[PDB]
Design a protein around this ligand. Structure first.
Ligand SMILES: *[C@@H]1O[C@H](CO)[C@@H](O[C@@H]2O[C@H](CO)[C@@H](O)[C@H](O)[C@H]2NC(C)=O)[C@H](O)[C@H]1NC(C)=O
Ligand SMILES: *[C@@H]1O[C@H](CO)[C@@H](O[C@@H]2O[C@H](CO)[C@@H](O)[C@H](O)[C@H]2NC(C)=O)[C@H](O)[C@H]1NC(C)=O
Ligand SMILES: *[C@@H]1O[C@H](CO)[C@@H](O[C@@H]2O[C@H](CO)[C@@H](O)[C@H](O)[C@H]2NC(C)=O)[C@H](O)[C@H]1NC(C)=O
Ligand SMILES: *[C@@H]1O[C@H](CO)[C@@H](O[C@@H]2O[C@H](CO)[C@@H](O)[C@H](O)[C@H]2NC(C)=O)[C@H](O)[C@H]1NC(C)=O
Ligand SMILES: *[C@@H]1O[C@H](CO)[C@@H](O)[C@H](O)[C@H]1NC(C)=O
Ligand SMILES: *[C@@H]1O[C@H](CO)[C@@H](O)[C@H](O)[C@H]1NC(C)=O
Ligand SMILES: [Ca+2]
Ligand SMILES: [Ca+2]
Ligand SMILES: [Ca+2]
Ligand SMILES: [Ca+2]
Ligand SMILES: [Ca+2]
Ligand SMILES: [Ca+2]
Ligand SMILES: [Cl-]
Ligand SMILES: [Cl-]
Lengths: 496, 195, 195, 496
């Protein structure tokens, strides 16, 4: 459950948020495969309710109406095609499994669904599954409203309705079986694992029950006896009754403390300095590395910060974001997930952004294709952070240093930091308001290396900065605080 | 017995116990839920307050004022004032349910509806008072700028051992999906207990 | 900024930080040094007090009263009132040296002699006040039963970053050999800070 | 430094406080040897100043004037005789080494010393050593008074005068050498180790320097290469700058938290219950077992509690004291020291005892001999706790179970507790206000055992309670809360 099941040597997955199956299939072949990406986290592939007010928000996809593979991203054949094509080039697919609930109890009965299925939320009727009133937690919930009223009561958060969503009775074998059939169909298609949406709202034992019913992975691409990779979404910053540790037995858990802490440090807020990252990881009170799925920002928390005051870093703050993602990709803690977003219009109405709901780029509701420009960037409002040189080269860096221990840490007592990974990679950051000029021990074999942040190693030369490491492993570094990317990274494969 | 009183015109992390997504900004505002979703964050005054003196069975009267600013960006979702035994008594400003409740042990002893639209993104003054004689617990909410107000009172019995010592503070909850973006700010807070 | 005030007519471990040989007896007395010798014991109020607001450079005035009962059984040996930065300012009632000192960073800024015999085994009322305007720090000691008094005042400068936040409390020291048996009791304590 | 150097199998030492050398010599042969006691801690054997007001207090012995073995306990020949005779019957002697200071700086110059030596404290002249003004810390001390003014400053507590006592300059090799010569003379006589008085007031490194100059133990009684046992008196309850751990490198340290905590529990104060002792030891925040010297009360802290409010248990509270000492002797934590006192008249003047200074039983200043009554108790006001059956039998219990792990813990959730030591011993306590009637697993071989608390195993029978342990190791226990000694202890050697 903890092993990602990626091909040999691939260490990261990217979230191609709201991408169509056909575009992901193409991306796998033309980029993700060649560039060493381990996998892709896809948006929920099952049928969801259509929300017209607001117009097709990203969150409508988290309100299931059936398990038919039919959404705005595509249909079942397109989904199968994508999984096959990606697997063939060594890029895995991880599905966002929405299994705690169906759609909102206040949803209109009808056929306003992505695949035309009929449902009557009011009477808890989902004939396309099928689910009936007795497959929900209405009678088990202890609150008068039927919704969660206190996060300090585990029974309320797990058995009551999460923001009005019909809560599935996951202790029933029938429900467990319906969900297992859905997940097994995906596994047989070739999916490598799942992101369990809203895990905090389900009992660890119930999730475990479903997981035990899952098949081993498709032997066409996976070794016999392989179990699906599992990462559960649990937001635990320490202020409540439910703890992330309760889910360690099912697989990995999202470590939300990671991005929040990192963001504060990189921004230099609350008296934090980069020199404090010396003991980053479990030292900061994070979960065990082998149970963690880490990331700088995710599809949900990258939104809602238009008015400032939030430490979360996103593509909106490109410079600081690249530094944070670079540090994450270089550090040995956890299994890393890279974010890939679409830009939306940040418009304010009385001091609050009103476009946090906006869905993917579209033409009258039909998701726009991802267009690739000559400079390898994307068009049609897809930001494609995974294509930024600095991020692209750092996921490669992570593959290269895979397994090497954290070593040769250095800091100037302020915001200039450096560390290596065994004898395969070294990275140095200058987050101070002054120049960095020092000779450091890199732990690397002597030679000339191309800095993979400012350029690439092309043929017999570097396109950007060159670092000269002497026979003793020491190298001179000069980083201006005015540099576009105030950090340098070198590894065994960027050596000339 | 201990009577205590404090007036905070601008916050500082030093005399606070912060749990979860709770921080104090550079300008002294207590900020909750800014960086997260679907979770609870809490902030308590560092010293426990004595609500009931076991030696005499005497229960204290308390009064507290605070100014908050909730931004919905649009309790299950909202800001709550709590007295947590070192059996919790909570005053919930639930923006999801659109109700203000006086809750004790998860049981809403009394609640009135409120229009979050009348206070959204604006400084709201809150006063919570408990008179141990009449045993009346009251809550007053008002938008000083528009003149709107919401009030709710009831009788609560705090004459129990569990209420001897409690931590006083705030608890803010952020929802999921479209309800993931509400932020909560507390600008000032004064509290006073007396036997 | 935070102003805080508290009145304790009888102690309880709950809102205190006890270090070493410091306990609260069944009758509510804070007891120090009863079970040990040649060591120091401390008791602080659980919440830190702000003496200086860095935002304005403003330093607070504070006033505190407490009643103690020292039993010599016959500071190097004695009971001290302290403000410890979270550079310590101490008011020492040294029974070994027979002097009352206003000490800052181990340097006695001012001291007067006192006859411990006039207060030994009897309830003594102590008042310590600091006026940030005049910068005058004063100490008043009196035996309410006999009418004896001892006073000492001086000017102390607390206008430094280190004094921003401090823990307020008591520190009692027991000596060795024949000086191993002094006990210290604090029966009540009231404190108030204001900007 | 940590090994007691006791004979094979002996696990405790007893403090024969203020006893004369001739009486200790006799006690060794007639009792301590036969009864399995490991050693004796003796009062300071070196010359001290005479205090006449109050009349010869116990504390005058902690104000040295020379290193001549001449005190109220006896002279050098009597001291040698005692060490030889005790060693011959397998009982070791540990000396109370007063090395941090000489006498009070306010002492009168003269020959009012226990051996007639001349000294002039005012001018720091101790010609019998010899020490001169330059052998003291007067110029190093940072205070205006020259005394310790704050225990939060390590320099003050170590370099300044402890309650007016002239503080020795222990960093000087001359001083270190004078002290080493004194200690080496004792080692050569046959002493097994030392209690380092006032260790908190000396730098760990200085003590270490002296220790490195010590000879190995006398091969007449000790194996070649044996180092002297060292236990340092350091009072660290957690409220100050100096910590007990700073002295771990020199030998064992007195764990003062032990007796204070135990006393509170046995008295049932502050909401403490005996059931909480389940994780007694390091679990309670105590120092490592192998660095600890434990005891219920010591010569100093057994005094000053006439007015109550103190948790410390002493012979004055016989019933509760026996329970505490029994628990200590049965528990595997630390090396145990048993106290042996003399009784004094507890007289109050305005609410405070005025006799905490009183010295040993005496005839015009001459210490009275220890007289033994037919019932094995002592006369002449010596209490002889070490002779109480309950304590005597528990030191034997400790020898018997030596090395056996803590096992078979049981508790009634209140103040009834029980535990064993491997398969060699079991003990049960009833500190509740009701009867104890339960069948417990003792971990012992089936058979009939004599309770060593209420009696002894004499010949073919028990003089007190008999415990019948079935083949499965279980045994019925009945202990009334009105019993004189509300606890029962059995071991491999009390079996019939
Ligand atoms: C809370 O009080 C603390 C302590 O006074 C403040 O921290 C200090 O701020 C001052 C003035 O800017 C600096 O000179 C010190 O270096 C700070 N101490 C540290 C360790 O940072 C803090 O600014 C206060 N916070 C708020 C919101 O008022
Ligand atoms: C909370 O604010 C209330 C309302 O202002 C305070 O009650 C008033 O105190 C003011 C100033 O002393 C008086 O002029 C009024 O007579 C009081 N009542 C009202 C209804 O205004 C109260 O003191 C505050 N409590 C705390 C703990 O700060
Ligand atoms: C300090 O307050 C605490 C909590 O109220 C007191 O502890 C309680 O005492 C009451 C009344 O005797 C008991 O009913 C409870 O069982 C106690 N709680 C616990 C866990 O013991 C305590 O007595 C107070 N101490 C003083 C000195 O006033
Ligand atoms: C400490 O005690 C002093 C002295 O009693 C208090 O000062 C007095 O307060 C009383 C009652 O309000 C007044 O009648 C007097 O005018 C005040 N001054 C004097 C010299 O008596 C003071 O309020 C107390 N401070 C605290 C923090 O409890
Ligand atoms: C509480 O109510 C009593 C009785 O009605 C009233 O007399 C008193 O003023 C009140 N006290 C406080 C502190 O509100
Ligand atoms: C402090 O001293 C000032 C100036 O002399 C005086 O006017 C004022 O009353 C004092 N304030 C306090 C709180 O003692
Ligand atoms: Ca659910
Ligand atoms: Ca409620
Ligand atoms: Ca949020
Ligand atoms: Ca001083
Ligand atoms: Ca003492
Ligand atoms: Ca010394
Ligand atoms: Cl996520
Ligand atoms: Cl001792």
């Amino acid at each position: 459950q903890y092993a990602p099941q990626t091909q040999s040597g691939r260490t990261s997955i990217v979230h191609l948020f709201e991408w169509r199956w056909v575009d992901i299939a193409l991306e796998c072949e033309r980029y993700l495969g060649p560039k060493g990406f381990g996998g892709v986290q896809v948006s929920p592939p099952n049928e969801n309710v259509v929300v017209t007010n607001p117009s097709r928000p990203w969150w409508e996809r988290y309100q299931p109406v059936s398990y038919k593979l039919c959404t705005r991203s595509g249909n079942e054949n397109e989904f199968r095609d994508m999984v096959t094509r990606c697997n063939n080039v060594g890029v895995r697919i991880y599905v966002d499994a929405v299994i705690n609930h169906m759609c909102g109890s206040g949803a209109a009965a009808g056929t306003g669904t992505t695949c035309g299925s009929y449902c009557n939320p009011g009477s808890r009727e989902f004939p396309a599954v099928p689910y009936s009133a007795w497959d929900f937690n209405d009678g088990k919930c202890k609150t008068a409203s039927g919704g969660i009223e206190s996060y300090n009561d585990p029974y309320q958060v797990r058995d009551c309705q999460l923001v009005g969503l019909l809560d599935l009775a996951l202790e029933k074998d029938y429900v467990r079986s319906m969900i297992a059939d859905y997940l097994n169909k995906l596994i047989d298609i070739g999916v490598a694992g799942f992101r369990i949406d809203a895990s905090k709202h389900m009992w660890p034992g119930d999730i475990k029950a479903v997981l035990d019913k899952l098949h081993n992975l498709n032997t066409n691409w996976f070794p016999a006896g392989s179990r699906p990779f599992i990462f559960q979404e649990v937001i635990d910053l320490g202020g409540e009754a439910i703890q992330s540790s309760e889910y360690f037995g099912n697989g990995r858990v999202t470590e939300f403390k990671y991005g929040a802490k990192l963001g504060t440090v990189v921004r230099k807020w609350s008296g934090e300095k980069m020199s404090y990252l010396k003991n980053w990881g479990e030292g900061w009170g994070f979960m065990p590395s082998d149970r963690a799925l880490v990331f700088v920002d995710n599809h949900d928390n990258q939104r809602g910060h238009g008015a400032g005051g939030a430490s979360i870093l996103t593509f909106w703050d490109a410079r600081l974001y690249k530094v944070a993602v670079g540090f994450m990709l270089a550090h040995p803690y956890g299994f890393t997930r890279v974010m890939s977003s679409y830009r939306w219009a940040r418009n304010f109405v009385n001091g609050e952004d009103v476009n946090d709901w906006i869905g993917p780029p579209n033409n009258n509701g039909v998701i726009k294709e991802v267009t690739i420009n000559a400079d390898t960037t994307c068009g049609n409002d897809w930001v494609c952070e995974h294509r930024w040189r600095e991020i692209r080269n750092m996921v490669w860096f992570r593959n290269v240093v895979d397994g090497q221990p954290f070593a040769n840490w250095w800091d100037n007592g302020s915001n200039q930091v450096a560390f290596g990974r065994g004898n395969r990679g070294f990275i140095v950051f200058n987050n101070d308001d002054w120049q960095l000029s020092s000779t450091l021990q890199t732990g690397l074999p002597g030679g000339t290396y191309c800095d993979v942040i400012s350029g690439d190693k092309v043929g017999n030369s570097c396109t950007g900065i060159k670092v000269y490491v002497s026979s003793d492993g020491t190298a001179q570094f000069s980083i201006s605080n005015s540099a576009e990317d105030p950090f340098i990274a070198i590894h065994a494969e960027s050596k000339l | 017995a201990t009577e205590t009183s404090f007036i905070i015109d601008a916050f500082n992390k030093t005399n606070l116990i912060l749990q979860g997504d709770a921080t104090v900004s550079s300008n002294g505002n207590l900020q909750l839920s800014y960086n997260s979703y679907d979770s609870m964050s809490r902030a308590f005054y560092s010293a426990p307050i004595q609500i009931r003196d076991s030696t005499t069975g005497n229960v204290a009267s308390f009064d507290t004022n605070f100014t908050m600013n909730i931004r919905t960006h649009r309790s299950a979702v909202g800001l709550d004032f709590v007295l947590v035994p070192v059996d919790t008594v909570t005053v919930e400003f639930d923006t999801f349910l659109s109700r203000i409740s006086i809750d004790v042990n998860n049981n809403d002893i009394k609640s009135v509806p409120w229009d979050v639209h009348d206070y959204d993104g604006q400084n709201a003054e809150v006063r919570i008072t408990y008179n141990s004689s009449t045993k009346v617990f009251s809550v007053s909410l008002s938008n000083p700028s528009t003149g709107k107000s919401n009030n709710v009172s009831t009788t609560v019995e705090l004459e129990k051992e569990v209420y001897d010592w409690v931590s006083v503070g705030f608890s803010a909850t952020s929802g999921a999906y479209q309800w993931s973006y509400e932020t909560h700010d507390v600008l000032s807070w004064s509290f006073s207990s007396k036997f």
